[PDB]
Amino acid sequence: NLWVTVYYGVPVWKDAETTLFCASDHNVWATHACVPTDPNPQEIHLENVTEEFNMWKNNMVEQMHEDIISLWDQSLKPCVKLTPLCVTLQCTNVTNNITDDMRGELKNCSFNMTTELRDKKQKVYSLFYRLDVVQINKEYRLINCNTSAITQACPKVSFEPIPIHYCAPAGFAILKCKDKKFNGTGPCPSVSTVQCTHGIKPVVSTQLLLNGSLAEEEVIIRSENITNNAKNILVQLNTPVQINCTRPNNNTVKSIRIGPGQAFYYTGDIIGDIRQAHCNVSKATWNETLGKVVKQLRKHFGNNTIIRFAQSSGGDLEVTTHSFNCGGEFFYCNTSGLFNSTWISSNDSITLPCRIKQIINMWQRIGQAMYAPPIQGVIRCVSNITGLILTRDGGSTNSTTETFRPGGGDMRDNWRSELYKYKVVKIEPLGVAPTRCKR
Amino acid sequence: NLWVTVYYGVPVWKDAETTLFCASDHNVWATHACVPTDPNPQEIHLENVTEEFNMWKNNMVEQMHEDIISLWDQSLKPCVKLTPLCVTLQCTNVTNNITDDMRGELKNCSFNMTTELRDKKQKVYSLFYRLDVVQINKEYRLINCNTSAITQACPKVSFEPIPIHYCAPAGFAILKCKDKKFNGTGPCPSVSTVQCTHGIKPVVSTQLLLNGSLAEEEVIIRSENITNNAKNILVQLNTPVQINCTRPNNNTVKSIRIGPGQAFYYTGDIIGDIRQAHCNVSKATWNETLGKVVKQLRKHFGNNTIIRFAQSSGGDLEVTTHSFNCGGEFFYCNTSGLFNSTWISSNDSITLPCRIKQIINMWQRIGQAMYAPPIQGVIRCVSNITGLILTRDGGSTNSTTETFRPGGGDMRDNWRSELYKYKVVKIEPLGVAPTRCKR
Amino acid sequence: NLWVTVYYGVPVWKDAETTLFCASDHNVWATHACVPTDPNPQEIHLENVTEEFNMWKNNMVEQMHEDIISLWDQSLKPCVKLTPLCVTLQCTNVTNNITDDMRGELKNCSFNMTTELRDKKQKVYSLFYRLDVVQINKEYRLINCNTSAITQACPKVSFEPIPIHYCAPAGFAILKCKDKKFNGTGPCPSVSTVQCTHGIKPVVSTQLLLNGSLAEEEVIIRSENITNNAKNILVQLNTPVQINCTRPNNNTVKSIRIGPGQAFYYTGDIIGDIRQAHCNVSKATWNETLGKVVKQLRKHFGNNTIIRFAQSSGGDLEVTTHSFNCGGEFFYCNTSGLFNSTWISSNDSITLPCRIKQIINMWQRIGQAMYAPPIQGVIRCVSNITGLILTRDGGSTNSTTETFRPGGGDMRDNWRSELYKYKVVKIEPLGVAPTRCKR
Amino acid sequence: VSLGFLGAAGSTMGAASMTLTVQARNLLSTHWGIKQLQARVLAVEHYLRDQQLLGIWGCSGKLICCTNVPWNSSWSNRNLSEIWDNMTWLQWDKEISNYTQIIYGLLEESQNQQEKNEQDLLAL
Amino acid sequence: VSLGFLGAAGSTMGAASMTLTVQARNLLSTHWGIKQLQARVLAVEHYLRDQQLLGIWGCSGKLICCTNVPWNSSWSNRNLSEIWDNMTWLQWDKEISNYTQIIYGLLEESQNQQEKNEQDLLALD
Amino acid sequence: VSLGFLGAAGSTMGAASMTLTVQARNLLSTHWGIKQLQARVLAVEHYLRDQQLLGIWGCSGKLICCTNVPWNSSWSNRNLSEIWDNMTWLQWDKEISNYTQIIYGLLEESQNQQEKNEQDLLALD
Ligand SMILES: *[C@@H]1O[C@H](CO)[C@@H](O[C@@H]2O[C@H](CO)[C@@H](O[C@@H]3O[C@H](CO[C@H]4O[C@H](CO)[C@@H](O)[C@H](O)[C@@H]4O)[C@@H](O)[C@H](O[C@H]4O[C@H](CO)[C@@H](O)[C@H](O)[C@@H]4O)[C@@H]3O)[C@H](O)[C@H]2NC(C)=O)[C@H](O)[C@H]1NC(C)=O
Ligand SMILES: *[C@@H]1O[C@H](CO)[C@@H](O[C@@H]2O[C@H](CO)[C@@H](O)[C@H](O)[C@H]2NC(C)=O)[C@H](O)[C@H]1NC(C)=O
Ligand SMILES: *[C@@H]1O[C@H](CO)[C@@H](O[C@@H]2O[C@H](CO)[C@@H](O)[C@H](O)[C@H]2NC(C)=O)[C@H](O)[C@H]1NC(C)=O
Ligand SMILES: *[C@@H]1O[C@H](CO)[C@@H](O[C@@H]2O[C@H](CO)[C@@H](O)[C@H](O)[C@H]2NC(C)=O)[C@H](O)[C@H]1NC(C)=O
Ligand SMILES: *[C@@H]1O[C@H](CO)[C@@H](O[C@@H]2O[C@H](CO)[C@@H](O)[C@H](O)[C@H]2NC(C)=O)[C@H](O)[C@H]1NC(C)=O
Ligand SMILES: *[C@@H]1O[C@H](CO)[C@@H](O[C@@H]2O[C@H](CO)[C@@H](O)[C@H](O)[C@H]2NC(C)=O)[C@H](O)[C@H]1NC(C)=O
Ligand SMILES: *[C@@H]1O[C@H](CO)[C@@H](O[C@@H]2O[C@H](CO)[C@@H](O)[C@H](O)[C@H]2NC(C)=O)[C@H](O)[C@H]1NC(C)=O
Ligand SMILES: *[C@@H]1O[C@H](CO)[C@@H](O[C@@H]2O[C@H](CO)[C@@H](O)[C@H](O)[C@H]2NC(C)=O)[C@H](O)[C@H]1NC(C)=O
Ligand SMILES: *[C@@H]1O[C@H](CO)[C@@H](O[C@@H]2O[C@H](CO)[C@@H](O)[C@H](O)[C@H]2NC(C)=O)[C@H](O)[C@H]1NC(C)=O
Ligand SMILES: *[C@@H]1O[C@H](CO)[C@@H](O[C@@H]2O[C@H](CO)[C@@H](O)[C@H](O)[C@H]2NC(C)=O)[C@H](O)[C@H]1NC(C)=O
Ligand SMILES: *[C@@H]1O[C@H](CO)[C@@H](O)[C@H](O)[C@H]1NC(C)=O
Ligand SMILES: *[C@@H]1O[C@H](CO)[C@@H](O)[C@H](O)[C@H]1NC(C)=O
Ligand SMILES: *[C@@H]1O[C@H](CO)[C@@H](O)[C@H](O)[C@H]1NC(C)=O
C-alpha cells in the first residue's frame, strides 16, 4: 500500500541536441564575440555511471563545423574586393636566379590596373605562383575569373587558431569520457561532467592532423566501421611527430591603391635565389610512429597480414596533398615520401616538397574565393603531428595484403577527432517513485 | 454575505494583435525557415459561442502581406545583378514567321555586353517583347534603366505557391468562423478554435482570384460597404471555373557569362511560328457563373435593376489586365472578353489574348525591378477561378442600371479573401467571481 | 534569541551597467523603431537618501555614443554611392561677384560623369567650396579619393535633432540628482527616481555646446580633475547666449542621373553676390557671460590670478573651429573673436566668419565619408549657447596667469554634459534581517 | 469525454470551473529568427505577470483561491444562482470589467495585512 | 563534503534524494547574439514548463511532495527495499518511462478534486 | 497617500517593510531590436533567480517569511530597536553584506531537512 511521491532535482538525463555557445578566454574566429571563461572550470567525477558515446553521431561536430564557416565568412566581409584583377595578364617565366625545382613555378605578370580615379590606369608588375594562373589561348588570367569573385583577406587579421571552448546552456550538461583507450563508440565506464569543453584549436589540414590531443597510452584507431573501405580511419598518436615547414624565399611585398581607400597587396620581388618550400619530418621518429600504427592496425585486420602504405590516389590538390596554413601562407605538401612502405611480420630527415597557392577555395565551396596577401620576409613554423587520416584502398579477393593511403578533405573529421570524448545531455529534474508518505 | 474567489484557467479572451509564426510541412517563400506543421491538427467546436468578426479590420492580412514581400525580397538577394545591360540596344522587328497576332511584339536586339574579363567585350543578340524595351530617340533601352536596378531572378528558385499555415503563439488562439455563407462582418454563431490556419496558397493575381477556397453553397458577395462605390467587392464562387493558359512559342534559351561567375539568361530564338499567348475559359461555364453572381448582386441592388459588366477602365497593365505567374512566365491577359454582358430580370470557349513581360515591378514598388529569365520550351498551365474582384462604377440621381468592372491590384485583397474566416484573440485566464468560500 | 527573516520587495540597490533602451514622443535618428513614451512620466522623491554620482564613469555616456553612431550609419545605407565622382576635375575660380573675403573660396569644376546608360557620358559643371577639393599636380580631385568612398546623404532625411529618452528595463531604475549646483562627482543629498531620462537632443558640436539644459542658478564648472591640465573643462551656463548663423548666398540646386535610379545633387549656380557665411553673438551678452565664467573659475585658481582666454591651438578644422549643422548645412566658424580677452582681479555684435564644407567625416572616423547635398535657397538658424568646452592649456609651474582655450571634438563630452545627473542602478529586492518570528 | 482547449467556453460558470487545468496547461504551449524569439519571450512575460499577481494575493499554488475580501453588491448585485448557472465566463467578464482594477487592489492589500499578522503571531 | 552537479548520479535513489538542491540550483545557471539569446530563452522555457506541472499537481513550493495517488503495482512490481537501496535514478527512470504520462494525468486529476473539496469545506461554515 | 517605487528608501526598516508590494509589482515592469529583446530576457532571468531562492528556502508564496535559522551575533551585534528603528535597508545591506552567503547556505540546509522530516511524519501516520 504505497503512494506516489514527486521529487524535483533528480540527477537524470537524456540524449539531446541543443545550441552550444562559444567561450574563449585581430583574428579570424572573432573570439571577442565569445563569452569570457571561468579560470577555475569545474569537472566532477561520476562514480558508478556508464554512458554510451558515439562520436560518429555527435551533433557537436556539425555545429562546430557551421560555426567555423560562418566566422570565416564574417571576417572577409569588411575587406577589399579584387574584382578589378580579372584582366588579361601578359606573363613571362621567372628564370633569373632559380633552382631547377622551381623552374616553371613562378610567373612575372604585367597588367593594366585601376587607380583611385576612374579615368586613370596604372601598369603593375607582380609575381604569381602558377597554380593561381591559367592560360587563355603569354596571355593568362587568374584561375578563378570564370567561377568566382575574389576577396582579399584583410592583412591585419590573423589566421592563427585560438582555442575555443564549447559551453552548454543552463539545463544541459556535457559529459566527458575519461576511459583511456576509448575508441569512440562503446559504453564508457568512467565519465565526468563538465560545464564546457577544453579549448579546441580549429586547425585546418588534410591527411596529417596538426596540434591536437595525444592518446594517453597507445595509438588509438577509430572508425565508424573498420571493415567498410568507404570509411575513413582516424589514428590518434600517443606521441607527437615534429614537422618543420618553411618558405625560404625572401619576399618583398608591395602595395598599391586600386580604388578609393582600397589597397592591393602583391609580391613585388624576391631577394636572393628562388628555392622551393618544403617540410622536414625526422626520419627515425616517423619510422617508429608507423611501427606503432601498424601494430594497432594488425589487431583489426589479422594475424600476419601485410600492411602497406601508399601515396594518395589522385584527384584535387586540396585532398591529394597535405594542406595547411603556416605563417599565414597556404602550403600544399607532398606526403608520398611518408606513406611509401611495406610492413611484414641515422637521424636524417624526410623532405617533403611543397607548393604555395594564393587563391584559396575553402570548405569545398564554389563561388567564394579568397586571395591570400603575400607575407613579407621568410617563413618558418614548427608543429606537432598528432594524428593521421587513412583510407583503405578498396577491397581484395582475400589477397591478405591491406593498403592504406592518406585521406581527408571533409573538415568534420578534424573536429570529430577532437570532440570524440564529449556528449551533450538534457537534464530532466522531475520524476516520481513510490513510498509510504500520503498527502 | 459573499466573498471574492480567484480562478485561474478561466476560458475567456479578448481581441488582440500579435505576431504569428509560419508553419509549412528551393522557392521564393523560404519555406525552410518555417516550422513543421501539426500532423494531427486540432480543431475544437465551441458550443453556444457567438463572436464578431470583421475581415476588413483583420490584422492577419497586413501581417501576411508584409511577410510575403519580405520573403520575396530575400530570395533575390543572392542573384546576378543586371546593371551591365543598361546600354543602348540596336533593335529591329522579328518578322520571320508572324501569325499577325503578334505583329511587332518581338524585337531582335543586339548589344556590346561585358565578359569575365573587364578588358573584353562580347556581342550579344537576344529577343524582347516590346514592353520591356523603350525607344530612346532603331535605338532602344530597357524600360527600367531610368528608375531602378534590375536583378535577375535565380533560375534555381521556384515561384510555385506552397500552402502556408499561420500559427498563434502560446497564450493566443485563432478562432475560425464556420458559418456557411458568412459575409465577413457580422456575428458568427458557430465558431471553433484552432492553433494554425489551414494552408493558404500565396497566389498572386489581379481581377480573377485563382486556386482559392470555394463558397460552401452559394456565391458570396463581400464588401466593406456595398453602397460605397469606392470599395472593392470580393466575390467567392461556389464552383470553380477552369482556365487553360499557354505560351505556345517554343523558346530556345541561351546563357552567357557577363562577369566572374555571373550568368545571364535570355531567349535566343523561336523554333516554330510566333503566336500570341492566350487563355481559354469554357463559355458555358462562364455564362452560368455570371448568372449566379448577378442574382446575388440583385439582393443588394434591386429586382428591377439592370446589371451590366464592362471591361476595366484604364491604367497600367498591372491593374487593367489579369496578371498571373504561369510556369514562371509573367502573363497579362485581356479580360474584356469575359466582362461584356447586360443582365435584365455548344462546347466552345472564350479566348483571352495575353502579353508576356520579362521586367516586373512587383508589389507596386518603385526602385526594385526583377528580371524573369525565360523558360526553355513551351508552357501550359491549368488553374481554377475561385473568385472575382469587382468595382461598381458611376453613380446616379436615380437610375436602373449598375455597371461592374474588374478591379483590384491591391494584394491585400487576395489575402483578405482567404483569411476572412480567421480571428486572433488573446487568452485571459485570470478572473474573479463571488461565492460563499472565505479564507 | 532572534531568527532570520526573509523579506522580498526590499527597497535597496547596487550600481549597475545595463542596456538601456530608446524611447521617443524621414529623420536621421530613428523614431519609428524607438519605444513610444509615457505622456505623463512619473518621478518620485526619495527623502533622506544620499547617493554618490560620478559623471565621468557613467556608462550611459558610452552607450549613448554608440547608439548615435550606429543610427547615423544606418541612415546612410539606402543612399547613392558616389563612386563615379572620383575623376579628374578641371577647375577655375568663381570671380563673377566676389566680396574680397571670399576670393579663392569657390571653384567652378567640370567633369565627365557617368549616366543611366553605361556606354554614355555627360558633361557636368558644379561648384565646390575648396576645402573639399584638392589639387593633383587646373586639375583637382575630391579630397577623399585616396582614403574613402562617399555616400550621398539622402535629401529626404532630416538632420534636425529629436529628443531621445533613455529608459531602464524592468529590474533597474534611473536615479537622478536634483541638487542644484551639483558638480558631477560628489555625494548628492537630494535624489529622485525615474524610469526614463528627460529628452536629450543629440546636438552635435565642438567648442560651444548648443541647445542644452541650463544651470539652475549659477554657472557650474565641472571637470574630471581641475588641476590636471590634460583634462577638459565643461562649463554649464545659467543663461543662454543667442547666436544667429547664416549662409547668405542664394543657391540653385541641380540634379543629374548618374546611374539607374541614382541621382546626384549639386550646386549649379548662385543668385546674387557672394558673401561668406557667418554667425552673430550679442557682444554685451557675451562679455557678461564670460564675466560669470571667470568669477566661478577663480574659485579653483587663487582669488586673484589673471584669467585670460585665447583661441584654439591648432590641429584639424574639426577641433580648431566651432562646428555645427544649420539647416542641414555644415558650418565651421572661427571663435577667435570670442575667446580673446584678459580678466584682471550698445547693441553691438561679434561676427564670426564661417566656412562651409560638403565632404564630411564624422565621429573622427577614417574611411567613411558623407556628401552633404546642397540646400536650395538661403539658410538662417538661431541657436542657444548653453555651455562651453575649455582646455586649461599650459603646463605652467610658476605663474600668476592662466590661459583657457576652446577644446572639444570628442563627442562623449557633449553627451556627458547632458547626462551628468543620471545614474543607473539595479534593484536588489531580496534580503534578510533578525526578528523574533520563528517557523 | 473531455473538452478541448477552450471547449468550455459557452458553458456556464459553474461548469467551466471544472476545466481549469485544460486551459492552464496551454499557457506556455535571419530576422524571422528575431520574430520568433519575440513571440516566445512574449508568451513567457504574460505567463509571469499572472503568476506574480497570484503570488501577491496569496494564491500562488492554486487554481481556485478563496480570499478574505467581501464581495461588494455595487460591482454586481446578481444572486449566486444566476451567476453560476445562467452565465458564461465571457459574459461575466464583460459585466464586471469596470471593477477589475478595484478588486485587484483590494486583494493585494488584504494579503499584505495578513502576512504581517502571521509574522506577529509567530513571534509569541 | 558535498558532491557537484550530477555527483549523485550512480548513487542509489535513496542516497541521491539528499542532493536535490544541488541539481535544482543549476537550472537557469550579428547572429552570434541570436544563438546566445535563443539559448537563454530556451533555458527559461524549460524551467517554467516543469514549474507549471508542480503547480498543477499541488507541489509548487517543494522538492519532495507527497500526493494522494496510490501506486499501481502494474507500473513497477518492486518492493521499497529494492527500489530505494539497489537502484539509481537513471535506472528507475528507464524502468517506468512508459507510465509517466499516466501518472501525470492522475496527479492532475487528484489535485483538481482536492481543490474543489477544499473550497466546499470552507464555504460549509 | 502611498509612496512610489523606491519611495520608502531612506525610511527605517520597520517602515519600509510596509511597502513590499510597491517594489515587488515593478519587477517585470536593424540590430536595434536585439537591444530591446535582450533587455526583456534579462529582466525575466533576474526575476526567476530570486524566485528560485525563495523556492528552495520554503518562502515561495510570501513577501515576509519566517524561518528556523537562528541569528548569529557574529553577523550583526545589534539590538532590534536599533536595527528596525534607526536603520534603513540600504545601511543594513552594507552592514551584513559579507555574511549573506553564509545565511543563504543555512536557509537552504534548514529547508532541506524540514522537507525530509515532513515526509517521514506523514509516512508514519
Ligand atoms: C537649436 O534649436 C532651434 C529651435 O528648435 C533650431 O532652429 C530650427 O531649425 C530647423 C531646421 O533648420 C528649422 O526648420 C525649417 O524651418 C523652415 C521655416 O519654417 C517656417 O516657415 C514655413 C514656410 O513654408 C512654415 O511652413 C513653417 O511652419 C515655419 O513657420 C522650413 O521652411 C523648413 O522646411 C524645409 O526643410 C525640412 C527639413 O529638411 C523639410 O522637411 C521641408 O519639406 C522643407 O524642405 C524647416 O521646417 C526651424 O524653423 C528652426 N526653428 C526656429 C524657431 O527658428 C536650431 O537649428 C537648433 N540648433 C542646432 C545647432 O541644431
Ligand atoms: C616557361 O615554363 C614552361 C613550363 O616549365 C616551359 O614549357 C615546357 O617546356 C618543356 C621543354 O623544355 C616541355 O617538355 C613542357 O611540356 C612545357 N610545359 C608547358 C606547360 O608548356 C616554357 O618553355 C618556359 N618558357 C620560357 C620562356 O622559359
Ligand atoms: C595596357 O593597356 C595598353 C593600352 O592602354 C596596351 O597597349 C596597346 O595594346 C594594343 C593591343 O592589344 C596595341 O594595338 C596598341 O598599339 C597598344 N597601345 C600602346 C600605347 O602601346 C598594353 O598592351 C596593356 N598592357 C598590359 C600588360 O596589359
Ligand atoms: C453582412 O451581414 C451583416 C449582418 O450579419 C450586415 O450588417 C447589418 O447592416 C445594416 C445596414 O448597414 C445595419 O442596419 C445592421 O444593424 C447590421 N447588422 C449587424 C449585426 O451588424 C452587413 O451589412 C452585411 N454586409 C454585406 C456586404 O452583405
Ligand atoms: C584662384 O585661387 C588661387 C588660390 O587662392 C589663387 O592663387 C594665389 O593668389 C594669391 C594672390 O591673390 C597669391 O599670393 C598666392 O601665392 C597664390 N597661390 C598659389 C598656390 O600660388 C589664384 O590666383 C586664383 N585665380 C584667379 C584667376 O583669381
Ligand atoms: C566636486 O565636489 C567634490 C566634493 O563633493 C570635490 O571633491 C573633494 O576635493 C578635495 C580637494 O581638496 C579632496 O581633498 C576631497 O577628498 C574630495 N572629496 C570627494 C568626495 O571626492 C571635487 O574636487 C569637486 N570638483 C569640482 C570640479 O568642482
Ligand atoms: C589629479 O591631477 C593631479 C595633477 O594636477 C595629480 O597629482 C600629481 O600626481 C603625481 C603622481 O603621484 C605627482 O608626481 C605630481 O607631483 C602630482 N601633481 C601635483 C600638482 O601635485 C593627481 O594625482 C590627480 N588625482 C587623481 C585622483 O588621479
Ligand atoms: C450549450 O447549450 C446547451 C443548451 O442549448 C447546453 O446543453 C444542456 O445542458 C444541461 C445540463 O447538462 C442539460 O440538462 C440539457 O438537457 C442540455 N440541453 C440540450 C439541448 O442538450 C450545453 O451544456 C451548453 N454548453 C456546452 C459547452 O455544450
Ligand atoms: C559506487 O558503488 C559502490 C559499491 O560498489 C559504493 O560503495 C559503498 O558505499 C557505502 C556508503 O559509503 C558503504 O557503506 C559500502 O560499504 C560501500 N560498498 C563497497 C563494496 O565498497 C559507492 O558509494 C558508490 N559511489 C557513489 C557516488 O554512490
Ligand atoms: C526622513 O527623516 C525625517 C526625520 O529627520 C522623518 O520625519 C520624522 O517622522 C517621525 C514619524 O512620523 C516623526 O515623529 C518626527 O517628528 C519626524 N521628524 C521631522 C523633523 O519631521 C521622515 O519621515 C523621513 N522620510 C522618510 C521617507 O522616511
Ligand atoms: C596473433 O593473435 C593474438 C591474439 O589476438 C595476438 O595477441 C598476436 O599479436 C597475433 N600475432 C600477429 C603476428 O599478428
Ligand atoms: C560595339 O562597339 C563598336 C565600337 O566601334 C560599335 O561600332 C558597335 O556598333 C557596337 N555594337 C552594338 C551592338 O552596339
Ligand atoms: C571628357 O573626355 C574627352 C575625351 O576626348 C576629354 O578630351 C575631355 O577633356 C573630358 N572632359 C573633362 C571635363 O574632363
PDB file of C-alpha atoms in Angstrom, chain B residues 13-105:
ATOM      1  CA  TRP B  13     -10.470  36.029 -24.334  1.00  0.00           C
ATOM      2  CA  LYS B  14     -10.282  39.450 -25.818  1.00  0.00           C
ATOM      3  CA  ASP B  15      -9.400  40.789 -29.329  1.00  0.00           C
ATOM      4  CA  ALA B  16      -5.690  41.207 -29.876  1.00  0.00           C
ATOM      5  CA  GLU B  17      -2.920  41.806 -32.333  1.00  0.00           C
ATOM      6  CA  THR B  18       0.236  39.795 -32.170  1.00  0.00           C
ATOM      7  CA  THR B  19       2.989  38.180 -34.099  1.00  0.00           C
ATOM      8  CA  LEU B  20       2.043  34.956 -35.808  1.00  0.00           C
ATOM      9  CA  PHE B  21       4.559  32.441 -36.975  1.00  0.00           C
ATOM     10  CA  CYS B  22       4.837  30.268 -40.126  1.00  0.00           C
ATOM     11  CA  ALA B  23       4.465  26.523 -40.294  1.00  0.00           C
ATOM     12  CA  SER B  24       4.834  24.840 -43.660  1.00  0.00           C
ATOM     13  CA  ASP B  25       5.273  20.967 -43.614  1.00  0.00           C
ATOM     14  CA  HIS B  26      14.144  25.723 -53.377  1.00  0.00           C
ATOM     15  CA  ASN B  27      11.430  28.504 -53.626  1.00  0.00           C
ATOM     16  CA  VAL B  28      10.738  32.166 -53.078  1.00  0.00           C
ATOM     17  CA  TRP B  29       8.972  31.639 -49.764  1.00  0.00           C
ATOM     18  CA  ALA B  30      11.997  30.277 -47.939  1.00  0.00           C
ATOM     19  CA  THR B  31       9.830  27.558 -46.509  1.00  0.00           C
ATOM     20  CA  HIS B  32      12.831  26.014 -44.795  1.00  0.00           C
ATOM     21  CA  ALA B  33      12.552  28.955 -42.391  1.00  0.00           C
ATOM     22  CA  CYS B  34       9.017  27.758 -41.238  1.00  0.00           C
ATOM     23  CA  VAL B  35       8.321  25.067 -38.718  1.00  0.00           C
ATOM     24  CA  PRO B  36       6.810  21.616 -39.356  1.00  0.00           C
ATOM     25  CA  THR B  37       3.051  21.544 -39.208  1.00  0.00           C
ATOM     26  CA  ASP B  38       0.995  19.675 -36.724  1.00  0.00           C
ATOM     27  CA  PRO B  39       0.456  16.247 -38.439  1.00  0.00           C
ATOM     28  CA  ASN B  40      -2.738  15.857 -36.406  1.00  0.00           C
ATOM     29  CA  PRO B  41      -4.091  19.418 -36.192  1.00  0.00           C
ATOM     30  CA  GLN B  42      -6.752  20.014 -33.656  1.00  0.00           C
ATOM     31  CA  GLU B  43      -9.951  21.904 -34.000  1.00  0.00           C
ATOM     32  CA  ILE B  44     -12.496  22.200 -31.299  1.00  0.00           C
ATOM     33  CA  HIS B  45     -16.084  23.316 -31.558  1.00  0.00           C
ATOM     34  CA  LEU B  46     -17.290  25.916 -29.122  1.00  0.00           C
ATOM     35  CA  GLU B  47     -20.895  25.308 -28.341  1.00  0.00           C
ATOM     36  CA  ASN B  48     -23.063  28.447 -27.804  1.00  0.00           C
ATOM     37  CA  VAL B  49     -20.177  30.917 -28.602  1.00  0.00           C
ATOM     38  CA  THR B  50     -21.030  33.831 -30.838  1.00  0.00           C
ATOM     39  CA  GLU B  51     -18.215  36.097 -31.907  1.00  0.00           C
ATOM     40  CA  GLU B  52     -17.945  39.142 -34.042  1.00  0.00           C
ATOM     41  CA  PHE B  53     -15.611  39.049 -36.988  1.00  0.00           C
ATOM     42  CA  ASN B  54     -14.512  41.833 -39.254  1.00  0.00           C
ATOM     43  CA  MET B  55     -12.458  40.798 -42.222  1.00  0.00           C
ATOM     44  CA  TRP B  56     -11.779  44.378 -43.221  1.00  0.00           C
ATOM     45  CA  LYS B  57     -10.024  45.189 -39.964  1.00  0.00           C
ATOM     46  CA  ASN B  58      -8.255  41.887 -39.681  1.00  0.00           C
ATOM     47  CA  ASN B  59      -4.599  42.417 -38.820  1.00  0.00           C
ATOM     48  CA  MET B  60      -3.673  38.997 -40.085  1.00  0.00           C
ATOM     49  CA  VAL B  61      -3.967  40.357 -43.600  1.00  0.00           C
ATOM     50  CA  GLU B  62      -1.483  43.100 -43.022  1.00  0.00           C
ATOM     51  CA  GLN B  63       0.939  40.764 -41.442  1.00  0.00           C
ATOM     52  CA  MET B  64       0.681  38.225 -44.241  1.00  0.00           C
ATOM     53  CA  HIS B  65       1.267  40.982 -46.737  1.00  0.00           C
ATOM     54  CA  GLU B  66       4.447  42.091 -45.075  1.00  0.00           C
ATOM     55  CA  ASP B  67       5.761  38.576 -44.713  1.00  0.00           C
ATOM     56  CA  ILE B  68       5.281  37.820 -48.350  1.00  0.00           C
ATOM     57  CA  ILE B  69       7.077  40.858 -49.521  1.00  0.00           C
ATOM     58  CA  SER B  70       9.979  40.249 -47.192  1.00  0.00           C
ATOM     59  CA  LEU B  71      10.342  36.628 -48.244  1.00  0.00           C
ATOM     60  CA  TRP B  72      10.195  37.705 -51.839  1.00  0.00           C
ATOM     61  CA  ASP B  73      13.000  40.172 -51.434  1.00  0.00           C
ATOM     62  CA  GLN B  74      15.213  37.789 -49.569  1.00  0.00           C
ATOM     63  CA  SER B  75      15.043  35.295 -52.395  1.00  0.00           C
ATOM     64  CA  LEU B  76      16.519  37.884 -54.762  1.00  0.00           C
ATOM     65  CA  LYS B  77      19.491  38.883 -52.704  1.00  0.00           C
ATOM     66  CA  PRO B  78      21.989  36.138 -53.723  1.00  0.00           C
ATOM     67  CA  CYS B  79      21.384  36.601 -57.500  1.00  0.00           C
ATOM     68  CA  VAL B  80      23.003  38.157 -60.541  1.00  0.00           C
ATOM     69  CA  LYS B  81      22.622  41.878 -60.917  1.00  0.00           C
ATOM     70  CA  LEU B  82      21.970  43.023 -64.438  1.00  0.00           C
ATOM     71  CA  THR B  83      23.369  46.510 -64.218  1.00  0.00           C
ATOM     72  CA  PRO B  84      25.627  45.876 -67.318  1.00  0.00           C
ATOM     73  CA  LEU B  85      22.510  45.589 -69.533  1.00  0.00           C
ATOM     74  CA  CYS B  86      21.716  49.366 -69.424  1.00  0.00           C
ATOM     75  CA  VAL B  87      23.273  50.023 -72.782  1.00  0.00           C
ATOM     76  CA  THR B  88      21.929  51.272 -75.994  1.00  0.00           C
ATOM     77  CA  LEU B  89      20.336  48.381 -77.804  1.00  0.00           C
ATOM     78  CA  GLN B  90      20.156  48.248 -81.583  1.00  0.00           C
ATOM     79  CA  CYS B  91      16.720  46.643 -82.355  1.00  0.00           C
ATOM     80  CA  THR B  92      14.794  45.526 -85.409  1.00  0.00           C
ATOM     81  CA  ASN B  93      11.377  43.757 -85.782  1.00  0.00           C
ATOM     82  CA  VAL B  94      11.077  39.930 -85.708  1.00  0.00           C
ATOM     83  CA  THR B  95       9.233  39.272 -88.940  1.00  0.00           C
ATOM     84  CA  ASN B  96      10.285  35.730 -89.711  1.00  0.00           C
ATOM     85  CA  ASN B  97       7.042  33.726 -89.028  1.00  0.00           C
ATOM     86  CA  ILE B  98       4.355  36.074 -87.622  1.00  0.00           C
ATOM     87  CA  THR B  99       0.717  34.992 -87.432  1.00  0.00           C
ATOM     88  CA  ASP B 100      -0.256  38.681 -87.078  1.00  0.00           C
ATOM     89  CA  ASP B 101      -1.425  38.192 -83.547  1.00  0.00           C
ATOM     90  CA  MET B 102       1.996  39.390 -82.534  1.00  0.00           C
ATOM     91  CA  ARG B 103       2.875  41.778 -85.248  1.00  0.00           C
ATOM     92  CA  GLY B 104       5.742  43.788 -83.906  1.00  0.00           C
ATOM     93  CA  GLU B 105       5.563  42.277 -80.419  1.00  0.00           C
TER      94      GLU B 105
END
